[PDB]
């Protein structure tokens, strides 16, 4: 993924046009309500400093400036010689709590040769994290959990609103659950655009899992200086909680009337599923001992997603088990394919819960239940020919083949299986009509304006030419059963 | 799974014969350690109680009897109504702690009809933990991530040896990490046969992921009464931490010297994946605000051995990328498949680290490397045609298939692919004669003796027939270039 320049070394303004590289990886500032450090990985010698650092560590900076960790941490120094070495990934953190002429939170992390170091205050319900880790593996579907996990982490954090955001393959996410203070506007069941999520935000998100922005009317403080000293080229502060949070998301915050936010990452296979977005309606800052709390529940979330969603595959699969028996039995025993196959005593149609049937075989097809017109029937599979793979699957068909949007209303969901497509199987689901609740604008009113957008309220859009989506164990069934009659012959 | 009748109930005595069915989830007594109360689910009334209760709640047995958990624990008893509803699985948990004129931890859960009720005693390195998290997360392979997991947790609880126990599709694990103190004997590297750890004890292990031995010479102390009032039957003590041992299990510990024991499942993907045994010489009693830690550390690594797995094997996948893109563009273009495949500039043979390649096509075969003789690769394909599927895989061919260990020199390891198996494709490894460390005793040696035995010094047994075992992506691989090659012809 490209980056721009930052600011501070030509770079052009930020705008909807081109926010998708942005560099926040590198702002040259952090959050005032704390300090960094940056020293050097084999010396310990101190580089970089935010210009706040005298308030948090009571010396001058032309002091620490130039100083040894060794002499300024002694106490620490070679913990953190053990505990990152030379070579290891810049995720990797080690924390730690410092008694200050009050007391502080050390958090250190390696990027390269650099050593960067965070001190914000820390200050010194021991079993609602264990009730939480029982409650969330004992839900029974993925709703209950994501509705568990809002319920816990706004119990623990007093956020004014706390919700389960889960991507979609077009990045587009949905609030799935929500925890809110009583009176707040309820974004559950809104979808959101991927601009609000750009690309790179969610590339880092994958690696570096929690982030925050304590108070979105505070001005940055920068580095000094703000290039390395090492390498002339600005500081990778991807790792670090007090990194500068981008003026886009800050004022998209702002017209969003939010406080203070913060969002840990639910990753599942190497992609990032979802975020635990958090809300508060006015500054606040939660002690870092609290977030580990949330990073737990974070890994937690990421194994529990895995596992309930393979059970409510597993669920529906067991649903359609005994159906499929059937059906295979009665293709083993087939003379002629369109006359065991369209048997009611099979119930094809009910089997993927469609509307209509197409059969293809011995160069002749026969329908069932409603369908198109003949010839549109002919350009249908004409069409299913040019599609290469053995399954196609489709909610809207206007989508992937204009000129079949006319044929929505009989046939506007498709799920086609071949055993080359000389011999297949269609199957057609109706047009619903459908009411998609938007959280302000859809994807098309995104890029109208310039910068981020003011309203927030529910916007329905009237999707048409739409049918009910196939759920996951629909085709997972499909492919079973098309490599079952593709072996019947 | 079938289950003798408890010793309470007329039930056999448990011997080495019939061992793998003992009810231990009903023992009808608990450790001493900790007191154990059961109460009605609706009603609340205390039904059954250890019979050292009274030493625990200083009260006397005839007065706990019969009385309400509203009388008893005013400040919980509606938090065991929320938290716990009828209906809900027996491994959620509930855990608080009570003011007792010292501090009591009581950790609740739900057995039907059933509330189970633990009362231990507890006391009142913070980020030991995080920095752990972020340590396992950072580990380069399985190895490292074992050695990181086995040395936190020896650290984190002063057990004299942390072991990570690897189980095998036959159910024999190996000790794959340990950190032991100086001097101890090492149970790294060897195999042990899968009686150590009988078939519902896995399964049981499977729910239930922590369970302990505080004292291994410590008499089990019974409940009153030993039967459930509401069914007449025995108590599940299936989720109870101070469920009585097995004393099979509790005498061979003894016979191996272990004052204490301890085991945290690791549980991927519903499959008993390894244990976190842990050994203490001496009586030992773990803090539960500890024990939760190594909870923790248990989903941690149920993820993390997931992660590392699936990453370790698709390392090996792109090692063999450019190879596999190599050989299936030389087959796309193939007139003759013999001599297309058997080109030394494919090298189809280091593709798979084999020493012999045996290539069906057209009625006949050839072979290259180190291969049987001709009328043993007659044997050997003629064979082949009567094992249904696709693919083929052993690192014993003897164990599949007499009369072919005597082929074993050139052709000890097996990995065929069918194209039926007319068109086929044979990889040959030969024999590797190995020395398994077995920790006392082979799966032979196992049930010679009625009870458990005394032996646990190392055991070389020596493994002839062998061949050095397919690694998982040399079987990946191999699907994938088989559906190749299948669809280039
Ligand atoms: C043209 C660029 C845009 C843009 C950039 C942008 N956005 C982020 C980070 C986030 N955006 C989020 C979106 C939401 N927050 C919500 O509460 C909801 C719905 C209730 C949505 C859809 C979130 C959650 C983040 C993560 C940070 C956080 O949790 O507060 C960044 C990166 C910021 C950073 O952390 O460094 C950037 C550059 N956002 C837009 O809307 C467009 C205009
Ligand atoms: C014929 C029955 C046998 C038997 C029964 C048995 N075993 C268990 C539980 C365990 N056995 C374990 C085995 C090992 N511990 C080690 O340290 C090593 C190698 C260093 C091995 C192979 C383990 C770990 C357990 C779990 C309990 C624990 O962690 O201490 C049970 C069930 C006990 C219970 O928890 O209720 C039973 C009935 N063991 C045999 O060896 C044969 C004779």
Redesign the interface.
Same mark, same amino acid.
Not at 91 to 97: E, G, K, S, V
């Given at each position: 993924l490209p980056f721009f320049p930052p600011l501070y070394l030509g770079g052009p303004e930020i705008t909807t046009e081109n926010c998708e590289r942005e560099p926040i990886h590198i702002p040259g500032s952090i959050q005032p309500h704390g300090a960094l450090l940056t020293a050097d990985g084999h010396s310990g010698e101190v580089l970089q400093m935010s210009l706040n650092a005298a308030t948090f560590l009571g010396q001058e900076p032309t002091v620490l400036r130039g100083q040894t960790l060794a002499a300024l941490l002694p106490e620490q120094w070679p913990a953190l010689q053990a @505990?990152l070495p030379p070579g290891?990934?810049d995720? &990797?953190?080690? *924390? @730690? +709590?410092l008694d200050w002429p009050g007391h502080l939170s050390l958090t250190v992390h390696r990027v390269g040769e650099l050593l960067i170091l965070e001190f914000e205050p820390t200050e010194a319900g021991?079993?609602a994290? *264990?009730?939480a880790?029982? @409650?969330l %593996?004992?839900a029974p579907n993925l709703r209950a959990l994501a509705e568990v996990a809002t319920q816990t982490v706004r119990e623990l954090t007093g956020f004014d609103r706390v919700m389960l955001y889960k991507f979609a393959p077009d990045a587009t996410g949905e609030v799935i659950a929500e925890a809110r203070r009583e009176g707040l506007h309820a974004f559950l069941g809104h979808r959101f655009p991927a601009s609000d999520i750009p690309a790179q935000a969610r590339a880092l998100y994958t690696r570096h899992l929690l982030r925050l922005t304590a108070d979105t009317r505070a001005a940055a403080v920068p580095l000094d200086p703000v290039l390395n000293p090492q390498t002339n080229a600005p500081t990778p502060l991807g790792g670090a909680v007090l990194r500068a949070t981008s003026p886009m998301h800050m004022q998209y915050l702002r017209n969003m009337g939010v406080g203070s936010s913060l969002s840990v990452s639910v990753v599942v296979?190497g992609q990032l599923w979802g975020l635990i977005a958090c809300h508060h309606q006015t500054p606040y800052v939660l002690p870092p001992?609290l977030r +580990?709390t949330l %990073?737990?529940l974070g *890994?937690?979330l990421? &194994?529990q997603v895995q596992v309930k969603e393979?059970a409510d595959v597993a669920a529906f699969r067991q649903s359609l088990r005994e159906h499929h028996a059937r059906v295979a039995l009665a293709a083993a025993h087939s003379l002629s394919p369109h006359d065991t196959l369209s048997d009611p005593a099979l119930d094809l149609l009910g089997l993927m819960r469609a509307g209509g049937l197409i059969l293809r075989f011995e160069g002749r097809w026969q329908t069932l239940g409603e369908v198109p017109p003949a010839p549109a029937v002919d350009a249908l599979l004409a069409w299913l020919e040019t599609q290469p793979g053995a399954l196609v699957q489709t909610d809207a068909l206007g989508q992937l083949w204009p000129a079949g949007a006319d044929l929505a209303p009989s046939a506007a969901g498709l799920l086609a299986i071949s055993v080359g497509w000389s011999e297949c199987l269609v199957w057609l689901r109706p047009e619903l009509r459908l009411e998609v609740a938007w959280g302000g604008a859809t994807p098309d009113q995104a890029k109208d304006d310039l910068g981020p957008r003011h309203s927030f309220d529910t916007y329905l859009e009237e999707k048409r030419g739409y049918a009910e989506p196939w759920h996951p164990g629909e085709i997972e069934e499909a492919q079973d059963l098309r490599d079952t009659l593709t072996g019947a012959l």
């Open positions: @505990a290891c990934p995720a &990797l953190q080690y *924390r @730690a +709590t021991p079993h994290l *264990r009730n880790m029982f @409650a %593996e004992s296979g001992d +580990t %990073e737990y *890994r937690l990421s &194994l393979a």
